[PDB]
Amino acid sequence: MTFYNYTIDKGRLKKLIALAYRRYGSARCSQLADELKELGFRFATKAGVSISVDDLTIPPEKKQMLEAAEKEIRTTEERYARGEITEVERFQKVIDTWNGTSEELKDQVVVNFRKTDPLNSVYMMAFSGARGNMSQVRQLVGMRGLMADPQGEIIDLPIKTNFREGLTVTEYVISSYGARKGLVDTALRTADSGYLTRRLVDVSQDVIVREQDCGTERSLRVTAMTDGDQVKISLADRLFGRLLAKDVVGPDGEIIAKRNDEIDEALANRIAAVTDEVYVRSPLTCEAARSVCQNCYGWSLAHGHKVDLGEAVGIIAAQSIGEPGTQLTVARQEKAPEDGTVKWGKGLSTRKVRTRHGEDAEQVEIAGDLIWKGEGKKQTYSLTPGSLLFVQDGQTVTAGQLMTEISLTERAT
Amino acid sequence: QFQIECVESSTRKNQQQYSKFSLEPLDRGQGTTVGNALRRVLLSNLPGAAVTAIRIAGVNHEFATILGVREDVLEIMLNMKELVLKSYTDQPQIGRLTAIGPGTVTAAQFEVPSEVEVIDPNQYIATLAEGAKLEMEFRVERGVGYRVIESLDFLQIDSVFMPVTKVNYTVEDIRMSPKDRLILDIWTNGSIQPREALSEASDIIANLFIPLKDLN
Amino acid sequence: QFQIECVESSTRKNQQQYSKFSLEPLDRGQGTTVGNALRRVLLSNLPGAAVTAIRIAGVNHEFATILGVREDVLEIMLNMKELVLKSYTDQPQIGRLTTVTAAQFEVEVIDPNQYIATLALEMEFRVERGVGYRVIERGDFLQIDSVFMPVTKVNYTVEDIRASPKDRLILDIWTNGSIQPREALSEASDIIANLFIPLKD
Amino acid sequence: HIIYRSEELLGAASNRYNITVRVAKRAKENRSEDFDSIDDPNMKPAIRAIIEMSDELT
Amino acid sequence: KASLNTDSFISAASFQETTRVLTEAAIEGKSDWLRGLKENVIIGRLIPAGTGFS
Amino acid sequence: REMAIELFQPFVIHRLIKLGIVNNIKAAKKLILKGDPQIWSVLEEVITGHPVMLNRAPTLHRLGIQAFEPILVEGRAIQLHPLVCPAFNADFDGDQMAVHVPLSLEAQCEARLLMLACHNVLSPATGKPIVAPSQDMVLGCYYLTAENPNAQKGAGRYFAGIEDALRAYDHGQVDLHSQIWIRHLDEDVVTEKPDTEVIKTEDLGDGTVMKYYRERKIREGIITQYIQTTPGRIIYNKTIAEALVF
Amino acid sequence: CPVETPEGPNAGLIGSLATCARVNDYGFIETPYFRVESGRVRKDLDPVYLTADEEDDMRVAPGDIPTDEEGNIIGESVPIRYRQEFSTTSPEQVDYVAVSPVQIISVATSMIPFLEHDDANRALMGSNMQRQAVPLLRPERPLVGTGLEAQAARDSGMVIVSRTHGIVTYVDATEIRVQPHSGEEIVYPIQKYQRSNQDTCLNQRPLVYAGEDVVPGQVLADGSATEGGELALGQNILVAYMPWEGYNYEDAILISERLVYDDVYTSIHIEKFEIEARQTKLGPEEITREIPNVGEDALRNLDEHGIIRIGAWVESGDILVGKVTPKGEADQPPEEKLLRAIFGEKARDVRDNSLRVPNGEKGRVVDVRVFTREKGDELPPGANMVVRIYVAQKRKIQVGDKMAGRHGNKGIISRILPIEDMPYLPDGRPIDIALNPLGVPSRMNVGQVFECLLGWAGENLGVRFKITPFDMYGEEASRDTVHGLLEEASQRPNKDWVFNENHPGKIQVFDGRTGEPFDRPITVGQAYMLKLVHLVDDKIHARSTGPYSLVTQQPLGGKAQQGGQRFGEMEVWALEAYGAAYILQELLTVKSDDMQGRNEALNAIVKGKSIPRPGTPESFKVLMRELQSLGLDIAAHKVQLSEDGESADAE
RNA sequence: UCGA
Ligand SMILES: [Mg+2]
Ligand SMILES: [Zn+2]
């Protein structure tokens, strides 16, 4: 037995249920979940968790961040009356200010729930994942945000209050535009997902595992599903419950992975740490007569072992896709720790351009070392083509000032 | 040890009797054992008496009216449901009521037999206005707790038999000894005394632990 | 109208007895006030015997090690804490001690083989009788923490007897081994009965 | 302990849709053999086919 | 489209375009051998999956 | 009771003629609608071992139809288990569930061996289980294994094993979030932010060295090992021991 | 109204008119507005009632701006709406202002206090659940009411109002007699327990006494769901936001036993039954008492006319009207001819068609009005005597009923605990409802916490606050109103435990079973809960074997006609994904659409030996004959050795 | 029309 010496969340409870299935089966796993809910029902009544008004702790830095955000709006409205910015440049400054202000309020809520009191009734329901969510907490103690029109146009007037301070009559009809849009989109979602599930059944109703083996040699190459910069599905999550078609020989010809070997949960972590492209058996490459082979399909994901002869895999495949159908709705920042005068140089042809905001920025279309002045710390920075710089040759920046913004369409009127 | 005393004994206008008791001394953690066990018996196990059935002598069901009375049969049965009565015979009794005149009907106009008394007078029943007459009669039966009603023109009422309304107790420390001091508040409806309800509640708990120490 | 019997009993390899009782018939609501009042008396208000103070030669404080013994002197304070015995309400006496060799002692010792030492040792302890617990703060005999707990675990469940409805109390008593679970129920019922007899008046 | 006896029967059989037919075909033999006046209300013929098949499995 | 171009005319007429499948099946003289699911439900027999496989 | 007497009506009538109470169906149907207490004793002996399939519309996945073993309860609603609530996607604000009763002997063996709720822990879509604490039991387990830095009441005490701390929780010795050292000789101890480094190395006499850690305290030459934890985490770890080891 | 709309299929197509909205003679909706002249709201004259012409011409401010006492407007930046866009301009440039903050919402949304603190999705549900609350036996006015309940009660038409400004003379339970002054005795009739359309009561109770001056517009007699003056749809009882032992797990309600014996949430439902003595061509039907095969067990409440009396307690399975029907079959089987020839007792020519009480129905009969011919009323053709029976019953609150509040916190009661098991306040008062606090922060139901904490302040004071929605100073009108009035209730010398300095909206609650206090303080308060029409009695349905369809020979569907549950296409796909092939064949053959398989399956359970292999279902043979009538030669064959013959599925 |  092992000793869990940490605080138990919802996601740490699902790892305990999945560990009891792999070792003991289904009868002892259901008894573990039957005893874990006697423990949860007993110590929730003994705790006495309750919601109150003052449990919704509004952070005291909200007033200091709302009057600082309105100063950036007041210095933009006065620039609009001088003809220095357009209507699109004024609209891009107002929306990016209030959306950026709500991100500082959302991060201040999580910090204030850990320094003031770790055992808070709103924080316990959201951090443990019982019923709350951070999109629902920020509407209770933070800012509501920027709502949109019934057609989709974001209104420039924000809702600075929340459900604890109370909305106004003007802020209630703006919030009703999204409540009606979210209500009529739910009823049309069930009619589109219901017809999609029916079409997936009739196209795969006669897909029954009839034979044991077919004797094919084709395979399907699977890799890590990376959506550009960040990864979504790892290699260990795709090899789970699928047989092998080729040997994996990474270190010195390692024979730990052979052909037609059932990959377990811990075995998929060993293949993903050696190679990146694994050839597995798939029903796309299956050569069978009006059926899918038993080795080409893989494991039963609800039983933990291989599939049996004579069971419809197409009905389970059509039901697994149509079930979540009703619940389906590039540049970095730069900084400088030293204040001084930048050195442009003749090596970069920094041309003048205009950004999406109402400010001028010299656009650099080539490389170059944007070196700023310093006493002992020579702060240097590299350029990038297509981005823009802000500092001019001869200007003394302040402490921690933004030097530039390096980079790591649709038509509208 | 175990000195029982009464701190105060308040009494409302013939409708409630509040008394404050005290227990000193006790053990290190027996302030909750004596306190909570005496509260659960006083609120659910004390027997009482109330009006079970009413024959109004002229209306067969409950969803009709009487010509001349301000209230119908249903509002009369709700006023007699909260009537405070007591008895000693352990038998269903019969009490009558007549009313002629334009005045209101109170609990003092009843005709109860021997060993059955009305504790609270001036209980509001339906009023008469100068042109009618009420000849209803009621049945007084004893019971424990709350009974479910699931003869000749009798209307059954789901009466209650709880003479004690609310019991409150706090545990206080005395001044090395970890002993406690328990005070108790008993609120009755006048049908029984709080000193008599404490003696009856202590009889049930003492008899619940008689055959657990002799046979074992 | 009341009957009480034991459903089944069990005893492990160590002397730790266990029994399950049944209370029938109880009134509506009386099954909870009986099982909860019996739980607080059986776990807290029960006299027991334990080791409260030991004395080992060559040991000055609770963190120094003694030559010859594999474990520290804190382990001797923990192994002597779970010593199952009964003093039969006597005056505090002096006990002596000369594999584990737990079978020898200078009071009837129940299950006399749990753990003493694994040396390749002269101890002098005392036995007191009381109720509750005591925590010894640091700063002759070395007084250790002792817990007088003759009954370790009490579980009770209340279910409906028939369909006025009745209740049925199923009481489970996990004793230490010094006293019987049937005997511990008769002692705990004597304490609750002595608190309501002068209250009846 | 009936749910613990069913998980041992479904395991080490290689076909969960075939060993449930042998339980259903043995329960009809236990029902025809229990046609006398003695009828146990706790041990159904469908439950007795699972206990008897797990004892002969070992 | 793949649901209507199958070998069974009963499984295609119950899904969509009943007047178009039965017109093509009558002229071509198609034959359903009751293979697979969604036919034995209409016929009234055991499905070939599950325990009705063998 | 009034719904089970209608669903299991041919099974009650067969038991009445077999026991010798009635002789036909007309004598049995008049005895059922009369309301005798002997009829409910027959209905109690019939439903034992008879599986009943429960079903909630709409049926999105295949775990929306599961079989159960019914019991006669008091009231007029179906007492559903709270653990199968994410499976049926059922909420207690007006949901109605359809009840179905099998007849043949082959249908009873398929509802028990293939359609029972205890054998449906894992979902058919992914490999992740859905029978898990969801809303009210996660909050009971988060508060149990939490850390309250104000209500200690006897923190920093050494106890002899797991069973010594459970006997100290029934008394008023320790709280739920007290810092408690527990002598535990096992090495498989998982925790948040684990470490293998040894800080504050203290050496005793006769060559014995104490290996101090952030949460552990191991006496090296392993002789003893003390674990700093809360008594709420000991009650949680004791529940997994009595459920997985039988 | 942007909030009140039904959810589901008709989401947005069925709207509701607002509070101050008005339709002119042309058919356009108008809204009143106050004139603003030079930054000063001219609240002296009548409004303008603009007919949606303020879009491209006028600048309209809502009713939320802070104004002064006839001087000016306090705010410097007034948010307005101009050409369907929101903007903040100068207060001297505006033209019109709204007359009320409840002008946007309807008359049902305005009954929700603290509407600005609740979400718009839960305010949609709170307005729909308020229109489903049953009238209780003794209603009670809310303590946190909005103040608009008095106007909605008089405009409903079920409240007797005065018109003469006179002196009340005689008051009883049936009429109220006053005399007009500056044929002088008018009689106001009072209906007593009349049946409604949704099986509820329409009882009216007298309010005034004899010898009292009245005014035109004064309540003389309130309705069933109406208290004195204002409307009352529920009760004010104690609430606590604490999880119990799984009894309030997922939107479930735990109530106490005190709500049962105090007649709280007890409504009266009056059902109506119908029978008719029609004209059968074999012989005329008449209502008699001597009906065959029914003894003295059901002929106790008849007055020798076949019809029941008034005030008879009927239960499930009784006989309300005993009606016979003549038959002319004369097609007796040889088994029944031998059984009748032994013991005699030759069968009559009549058949018992008596009106009976359905399953799970009981009550007291209150109206046995019979409408026959030659009495002054018209009858439908083919009918001799029309009997109408009205049965009233008193339903208490039970396990399985659906209760809700004014903020969308609906739920179903799962357990009714006694008062000694519920938690209790430190004065000894127990807790009625133990609600779950987990559903509060996930749905943004903040106004229900403001309502219970303010109603608890009105409980200890007895003042019955009236709080209008949509304020005043920000953060000084909702938090410091509740916490400021809770401090005033704690200043009493008898109530010091009501308010705490550390935790303001919380007190210490003790457990009822063990007597030990909980570890954390719990928010208590006086919540206003309603009782909806979705009771547990109307959802019970079961069927063993009943009627069947006309063509497909399948079981019917319906609670009132003993129907069966439908096993649709999504339910077949779950069993097809399982291994349940024998359960799927059983549900489609021996339980539906088989005139032969249903007989052998029912005979197998009674005898005790089940048989396999059911026959061909009836619904396939109907489709086979329908495709042959379309001109398609479709048939079934056999592929056996040297034999290709068509099979006869019908014959 | 109304519930999920
Ligand atoms: Mg639901
Ligand atoms: Zn293959």
Author numbering:
A (entry chain Z): 1 to 329, 343 to 391, 395 to 424, 431 to 435
B (entry chain A): 3 to 152, 164 to 188, 192 to 232
C (entry chain B): 3 to 100, 106 to 113, 118 to 131, 136 to 154, 162 to 185, 189 to 226
D (entry chain E): 11 to 68
E (entry chain Z): 1171 to 1224
F (entry chain D): 377 to 597, 602 to 626
G (entry chain C): 413 to 594, 602 to 890, 892 to 1071
Copy text from the publication.
Second, cyanobacterial RNAP contains by far the largest sequence insertion 3 (SI3) “insertion” in its β′2 subunit (630 residues in Synechocystis sp. PCC 6803; shortened as Syn6803 herein) out of all bacterial RNAPs. The largest by far SI3 (~65 kDa) of cyanobacteria stretches across the “body” of RNAP and interacts with the initiation factor σ, thus sealing the main cleft of the enzyme. Notably, the SI3-head module forms a SI3-σ arch that seals the main cleft of RNAP and stabilizes the transcription initiation complex.
The Syn6803 RPitc complex was reconstituted using the recombinant Syn6803 RNAP, Syn6803 σA, a nucleic-acid scaffold composed of a 26-bp upstream dsDNA, a premelted 13-bp transcription bubble, a 28-bp downstream dsDNA, and a 4-nt RNA primer. The structure of Syn6803 RPitc was determined at a resolution of 3.1 Å through a cryo-EM single-particle method. Our structure shows that in cyanobacterial RPitc, the RNAP-σA holoenzyme adopts the closed conformation of its clamp domain, induces near 90° bend of the promoter DNA at both junctions of the transcription bubble, and accommodates the promoter DNA as other bacterial RNAP-σA holoenzymes. Cyanobacterial RNAP SI3 folds into a seahorse-shaped structure that can be further divided into four domains: SI3-tail (residues 343 to 424), SI3-fin (residues 884 to 973 and 424 to 478), SI3-body (residues 478 to 619 and 729 to 884), and SI3-head (residues 619 to 729). The SI3-tail and SI3-fin bind the loop and stem of the rim helices, respectively; SI3-fin contacts the β-lobe loop that stabilizes the downstream dsDNA; SI3-body extends to the top of the main cleft and shields the lobe and protrusion domains; and SI3-head interacts with σA. The SI3-head domain of RNAP tethers σA by making interactions with the σA1.2 helix and the specificity loop of σA2, the key structural motifs that recognize the flipped-out −11 nucleotide within the −10 element of promoter DNA to initiate dsDNA melting.
